[PDB]
Amino acid sequence: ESADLRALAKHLYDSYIKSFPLTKAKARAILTGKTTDKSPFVIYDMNSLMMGEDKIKFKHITPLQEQSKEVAIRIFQGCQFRSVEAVQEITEYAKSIPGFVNLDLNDQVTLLKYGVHEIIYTMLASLMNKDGVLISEGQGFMTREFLKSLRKPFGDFMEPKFEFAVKFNALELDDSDLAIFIAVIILSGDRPGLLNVKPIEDIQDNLLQALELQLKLNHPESSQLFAKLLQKMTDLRQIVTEHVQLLQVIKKTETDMSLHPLLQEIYKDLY
Ligand SMILES: CN(CCOc1ccc(C[C@@H]2SC(=O)NC2=O)cc1)c1ccccn1
């Protein structure tokens, strides 16, 4: 019934607020000009990239990769580092979805493993506009053209995300909508190697109802927003497979690669 669907929507939105530091609301403000405390440092070329990394050096030190390697790869490892952090926030959020923790532990792993990237790219869109993407928790803004200049391999790993983002952001979803959308993505019963599909689908069915109600109430005038949003799920899935193909190419043609352990777990045998 409706009351429970709304309570489910709010539960998810609250845990979403607690699990993810940089929400779309905060992100759009920064990208717009609101919040009077700092303007994002913009990296649009190699000089600015240097100045950006220097400023980070004026500050304390953090276990990362303080250059001596190629730009395209530092940037590449930078995204992966941020992804490791994302996996932890997303996993915490996943555990807040009613029913999730009670699913077979193996399926939780599988759902997480296949849904984490689709969620990372969904959340990333919130930090992107047609010209760039926020980095360092809003501290910075790296341009789309700069990312597209990196040597060919790495020069085009973000372009598909930007293209998806522009389309996705045109739906103008807010955080309360995204929180439910993300839950629907995690609770996908079509993931490879699932042992108990039934339990997963019943949870997703409730999530879908809650999402539909949310979009109708929060966006009364947006015609077929629900259906359009569900279709974006095909694009997200494609972005992930593309990315995995690009990772294979790199592993096959780069001297060496090196992927963070947590990411190694996620990528080990994935679509
Ligand atoms: C926050 N930014 C913005 C771009 O942000 C991302 C792009 C792709 C991912 C997915 C990663 S990259 C990989 O191979 N596997 C993954 O899970 C995650 C974030 C940066 C950009 C440069 C340096 C540090 N930070």
Swiss-Prot record:
Subunit structure, interactors included: Interacts with FOXO1 (acetylated form). Heterodimer with other nuclear receptors, such as RXRA. The heterodimer with the retinoic acid receptor RXRA is called adipocyte-specific transcription factor ARF6. Interacts with NCOA6 coactivator, leading to a strong increase in transcription of target genes. Interacts with coactivator PPARBP, leading to a mild increase in transcription of target genes. Interacts with NOCA7 in a ligand-inducible manner. Interacts with NCOA1 and NCOA2 LXXLL motifs. Interacts with ASXL1, ASXL2, DNTTIP2, FAM120B, MAP2K1/MEK1, NR0B2, PDPK1, PRDM16, PRMT2 and TGFB1I1.
Residues that coordinate or bind rosiglitazone: 80-83, 117, 243, 267
Domain NR LBD: from-to ranges: 4-269
Keyword DNA-binding: yes
Family: Belongs to the nuclear hormone receptor family. NR1 subfamily.
Gene: PPARG
Motif (9aaTAD): 261-269
Involvement in disease: Defects in PPARG can lead to type 2 insulin-resistant diabetes and hyptertension. PPARG mutations may be associated with colon cancer.
Biological function: Nuclear receptor that binds peroxisome proliferators such as hypolipidemic drugs and fatty acids. Once activated by a ligand, the nuclear receptor binds to DNA specific PPAR response elements (PPRE) and modulates the transcription of its target genes, such as acyl-CoA oxidase. It therefore controls the peroxisomal beta-oxidation pathway of fatty acids. Key regulator of adipocyte differentiation and glucose homeostasis. ARF6 acts as a key regulator of the tissue-specific adipocyte P2 (aP2) enhancer. (Microbial infection) Upon treatment with M.tuberculosis or its lipoprotein LpqH, phosphorylation of MAPK p38 and IL-6 production are modulated, probably via this protein.
PTM comment text: Phosphorylated in basal conditions and dephosphorylated when treated with the ligand. May be dephosphorylated by PPP5C.
Full-protein residues shown: 235 to 505 of 505
Expression triggers: (Microbial infection) Expression increases when incubated with M.tuberculosis or its lipoprotein LpqH; induction is TLR2-dependent (at protein level).
GO process terms (BP): BMP signaling pathway; cell differentiation; cell fate commitment; cell maturation; cellular response to hypoxia; cellular response to insulin stimulus; cellular response to low-density lipoprotein particle stimulus; epithelial cell differentiation
Entry keyword set: Activator, Biological rhythms, Cytoplasm, Diabetes mellitus, Disease variant, DNA-binding, Glycoprotein, Isopeptide bond, Metal-binding, Nucleus, Obesity, Phosphoprotein, Receptor, Transcription, Transcription regulation, Ubl conjugation, Zinc, Zinc-finger
Domain notes: The 9aaTAD motif is a transactivation domain present in a large number of yeast and animal transcription factors.
Tissue specificity remark: Highest expression in adipose tissue. Lower in skeletal muscle, spleen, heart and liver. Also detectable in placenta, lung and ovary.
Top-rank taxon: Eukaryota
Protein name: Peroxisome proliferator-activated receptor gamma
